[PDB]
Design a protein around this nucleic acid. Structure first.
Lengths: 234, 54, 77, 49, 65
RNA sequence: AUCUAGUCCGGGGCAGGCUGAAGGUGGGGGAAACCCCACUGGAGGGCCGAAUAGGGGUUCUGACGUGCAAUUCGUUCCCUUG
RNA sequence: GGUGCAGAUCCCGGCGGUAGUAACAGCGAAGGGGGGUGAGAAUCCCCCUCGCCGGAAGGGCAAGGGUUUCCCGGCAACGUUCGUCAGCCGGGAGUUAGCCGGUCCUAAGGUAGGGCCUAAUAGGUACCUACCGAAAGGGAAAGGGGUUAACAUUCCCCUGCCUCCCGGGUAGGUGCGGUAACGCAAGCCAGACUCCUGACGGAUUGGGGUAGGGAGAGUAGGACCACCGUCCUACCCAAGCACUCAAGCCCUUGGAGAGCCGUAACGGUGAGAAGAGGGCGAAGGUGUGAUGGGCCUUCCGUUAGGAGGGUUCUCCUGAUCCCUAGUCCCCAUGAAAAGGGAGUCUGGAACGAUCCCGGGAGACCGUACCUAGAACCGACACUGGUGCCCCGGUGAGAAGCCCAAGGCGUCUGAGGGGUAACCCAGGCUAGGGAACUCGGCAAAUUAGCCCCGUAACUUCGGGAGAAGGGGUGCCUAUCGUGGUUUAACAAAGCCACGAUAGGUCGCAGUGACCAGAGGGACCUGACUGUUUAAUAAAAACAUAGGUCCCCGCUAGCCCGAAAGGGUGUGUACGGGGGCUAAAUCCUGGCCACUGGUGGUUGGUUAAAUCCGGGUUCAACCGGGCGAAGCCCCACCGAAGGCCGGGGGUACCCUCUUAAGGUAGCCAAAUGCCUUGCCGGGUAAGUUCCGGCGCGCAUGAAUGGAUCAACGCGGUCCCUACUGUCCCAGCCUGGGGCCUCGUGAACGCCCUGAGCCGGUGCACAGUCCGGCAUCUCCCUACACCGAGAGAAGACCCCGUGGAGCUUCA
RNA sequence: GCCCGGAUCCGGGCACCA
């Protein structure tokens, strides 16, 4: 047979790369080591990211972008560090917060920029404490474990209700993926030939075998439901 | 159409221009390479042992 | 070498007693000087494609006159 | 017409000339009829770039 | 059909109804949190709003402030 | 990868008309909620439309079929703010 | 010994027959008279006239070509014919820049050297440094009039401008006005930091201009004059410099509401409206440039030239070109740099400009010509493709028709013909009106604009231009509304649109041109979109909506030999992977099999290690320990899927193998029998519609039922209409026919080929027996030559292949 | 051919190039 589409998508040709030069910049925390203060100077649109970003100016003259928090205005003053209080937009440390506090853009280590709860409308809560680490419940309902001194922002990422309006036509979804790396439109595998897909071929379009496949299948075969524990709607 | 109408679009700038080293019109312009002597990423003259029958 | 928007077409015949018609190509108009975060160009400041070498003709005569009005300034002194 | 001076600045076998035998050579060699074996035409033949 | 009458007879009655209820929430008369309902608030992009009197820009939801 | 397939960067285009979404104003009613009419407004993968503006390639199974042409020509048609 | 040819769809060379035959028509153009040159004119040159294009056949310039450009002289070949002609042949020539472009900057992207990798490199490359990457992006500064056979924002004349450097002054160092917004000749040289032009989408609308186009008056010139006196041409001005500006945004005063102000529209206002004053401020305009030109024209000499006249005034219309503001939209938010200007500080000297005057300098490379029914690519002077930018009447119009400016009759073979048959395009037909045919294919009908009027159905938006009815010319006068002019309204001059009254002609008034036939019913895909370049445009693909699976980031999925890499400048409202296919009403039962996931008392389980035997040591025999997997158990059907039979009285029991087809739908694009049976429609119905349901072999995201809107999708019926037919006839353009010029190709053992009956591998031009038959030429027809064209694609064989699949 | 379990046979997982 021939290489599948997902196998071509891994060579990273220009058809499958992200057009990142169109974004404001990486939206990460900077490496700072004090108790500073900042001012929001702008709220911008980041093309293919789903959440608006804020631009922050530190008292020592440092510029950086972080995902915007719902309810933060331009010209507002925020504090960064271990002594920061519990207010929207403040960058705090997770070791200092009580139980059930809603945060976002949570780091795993000290100084990685933020990993979890970054997409629009998402947030995390503080759910306990291990010996050396705090337990945080993510939006997937799973639990992750992070350092004592990992930074996070207080509040919820702006842009909720994003998905309550139907796109309503094939062209509204044509722009959406012009600024992203996602391949669109998507051809069903049953509509291909046997040389291009394990589902292709036959008089009647059908998945010829059960769709569930094991975790040990070689590349070029992991299609359908991957290592599923269950199927069906209920 | 495959034939006569598509040969009309063969009047743009060519794929191969003159090469300084060999004096042949084999320098692939878009790749920075002579397809006859290798000038562009070979210091040695491009030469292969299949280049004539034995 | 046909049309390009980076040039405006002009044709001249009103203030005109000779008799012919032609077309002149000039570059689009400039704007008050640029980078951006504070975003307000000013009142009394001059921008021309060439420079008449002017000095006080192209700027007001206040303290920060050419820089900006008293808006984005007093946190600088 | 924009020539990058490798064809118009150097002139010779690179954008120059396609000429008949000089008339005095035809007389000197007494040739029955004397031609230039490399004659070409702009419209029929092809010149390398 | 209200605001959704610009689609005609396409996309289905229930799909047009959901689109129309979201847009009718966006175009409600909103009140500015900072000054008051004085100048009306408008959307710049998804999640970006400002009031046209006080010129204050803030971050909110995708279709409401 | 001068053809063609997809993509990214920088450019150039689509004569002329029609319909009339939300919103706005003024009359007329009923206590009310709210309804009717006229006008204004200018939305939409809306509509009609230039041999040769651009793009396509359905019919005649038309002409040609040692061609104008190793895929063209005529008629009848399709699209044209995305 | 490279040694003898008739065959190899033999190789190469020369030459026949077809045959002086086809073709030199078709894609909407056309020539005629008079004269000239020349050995020789349908074809070259001059004059008159006639025809065609006129959103291209005219004008301007790319990539590409490469001398094709211009002058002189030619005609052996070259051009579909001829040629005295030419994009051909011979001989001479031609491209001029501080201001145009390259050159410079960066974009998507790439490369070299280092590192890391590689057995090695001419191999890979996430990192560092440097460089490259646009003759339509960014990017200091020029216009007019003229000049050659051929170049001209490049040469001459006039008037300029930019950058840098000199010399002389001056403003500053040490100066002023305003409440303010701001106004200005304001020092110099060396740094640092910062800010703002550069520098950005789509849609829609107002305002202001300009190119262009018109009417009237006048002066010159021209055209017509059967009679009228009208018609055509000319009347006009660059950059730079001085002055001026609407929108918008700012500054003082002022102090408003149950209201005021204002737009085309949205609107504005105590966080300060209207009213009064002001500041910054487009495109353009008006002066100067310019008693300079260039445009029209008269007279004399008709060589060289010379001498005069005019170039004014009042209005209208007007961009798709220009600049200026609004408003709206996005699960679109719509490049970066060099290079510019300014500001704030620090240091240094006392001389000194961003202002006037004079002087000097500004490398290098491109520049001719075509830019296409003859200069580019397609073997060709190829009806294809490659181009982009621009251009009075009728009319909504860049449409169709007619004509200016400009161009052409070279989409380069002609002549004769009462013009045969026939073919390719076109016009019309009495009576009938689909009787033609697989099928109304083709052709016909209708058609613009205004007013009235408009059904079932429906997702309430549509259907819908449904269907249907009435009006329309010309002339003679009017009225209303609006624009514009130093212009509230009213008057005056121009201009546009909408109506009214009367008169009148024809077969016909959207009189040509342009320009929808309509209705009823079923299937199918929801819709706009995509596809087999060169026989398939579809019901196939996509789609929005729905639903399921993997994954907390040092993840999940994928690429690499490694170094490493794509998603990723990303973080579950996400990235990756399946199936279904808008909306509405719904989506049943089954975990036995296969597959996936998890678990485990327990069995089996490789290498290595450990123990015993053996071997003066080993090989070699045993035993123990023994991971994942498998055996075993459980769960999962919007996982693959499956949904029967028998016996008894809708009910109960049994077997395959777990259950035994629920809601719905149907003789279906799915029903073998089969033209199923009954009804509808027709005089007559194997198709169609409705109903039934012995369903060979319908059925639920493997999606079931269901059609509003949509379709260059499939089918049936009706009305209208017609040469589709009964059944053909006449007319027209281009060919054919006759003549001149150019000039091929296929068939070909042979030239010996009339036919009928036979023989024979079973259908003879040639053999046997008969009957026939004087020779040549022209047109027409294609029945025969098992006619010509291609080592049959069907089928079988070969211990021939290639791509796909899996339980080989 | 073995292990192992079950009544010489049976079952389960592995050994087995004429």
């Amino acid at each position: 047979g021939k290489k599948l589409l997902q196998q071509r998508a891994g060579r990273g040709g220009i058809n499958f790369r992200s057009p990142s030069w169109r974004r404001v910049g990486p939206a990460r925390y900077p490496n700072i080591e004090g108790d500073h203060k900042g001012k929001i100077i702008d709220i911008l649109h980041n093309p293919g990211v789903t959440a608006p970003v804020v631009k922050v100016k530190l008292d020592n003259g440092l510029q950086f972008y972080i995902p915007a928090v719902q309810g933060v205005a331009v010209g507002q003053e925020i504090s960064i560090g271990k002594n920061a209080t519990i207010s929207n937009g403040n960058i705090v440390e997770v070791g200092q917060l009580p139980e059930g506090t809603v945060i976002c853009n949570v780091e795993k280590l000290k100084g990685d920029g933020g990993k979890f709860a970054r997409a629009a409308g998402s947030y995390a809560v503080i759910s306990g404490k291990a010996g050396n680490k705090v337990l945080i419940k993510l939006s997937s309902e799973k639990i992750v474990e992070v350092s004592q001194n990992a930074r996070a922002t207080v509040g919820i990422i702006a842009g909720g209700g994003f998905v309550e309006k139907p796109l309503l036509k094939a062209g509204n979804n044509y722009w959406k993926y012009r600024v992203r790396a996602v391949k669109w439109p998507v051809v069903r595998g049953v509509a291909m030939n046997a040389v291009s897909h394990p589902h292709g071929g036959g008089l009647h379009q059908s998945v010829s075998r059960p769709s569930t496949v094991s975790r040990n299948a070689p590349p070029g075969r992991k299609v359908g439901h991957i290592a599923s524990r269950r199927t069906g709607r209920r | 159409m495959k034939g006569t109408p598509s040969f009309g679009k063969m009047n743009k700038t060519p794929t191969h221009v003159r090469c300084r080293r060999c004096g042949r019109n084999s320098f692939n312009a878009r790749k920075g390479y002579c397809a006859a002597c290798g000038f562009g990423r070979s210091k040695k003259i491009r030469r292969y042992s299949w280049q004539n029958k034995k | 070498s046909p049309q390009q928007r980076s040039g405006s077409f002009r044709k001249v015949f009103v203030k005109l007693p000779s008799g012919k018609s032609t077309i002149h190509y000039e570059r689009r108009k400039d704007n008050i000087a640029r980078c951006g975060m504070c975003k307000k160009p000013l009142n009394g400041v001059k921008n021309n494609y060439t420079y008449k070498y002017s000095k006080t003709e192209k700027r007001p005569e206040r303290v920060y006159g050419g820089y900006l009005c008293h808006k984005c300034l007093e946190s600088l002194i | 017409k924009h020539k990058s001076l490798g064809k118009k600045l150097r002139l010779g076998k690179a954008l120059k000339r396609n000429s008949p035998i000089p008339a005095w050579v035809i007389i000197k060699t007494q040739a029955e009829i004397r031609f230039n074996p490399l004659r070409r035409n702009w419209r029929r033949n092809n010149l390398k770039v | 059909t209200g605001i959704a009458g610009r689609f005609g007879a396409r996309y289905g009655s229930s799909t047009r109804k959901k689109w129309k209820e979201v847009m009718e929430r966006r175009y409600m008369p909103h009140q500015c949190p900072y000054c008051k309902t004085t100048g009306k608030v408008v959307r710049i992009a998804s999640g970006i709003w400002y009031c046209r009197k006080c010129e204050t820009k803030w971050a909110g939801l995708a279709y409401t402030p």
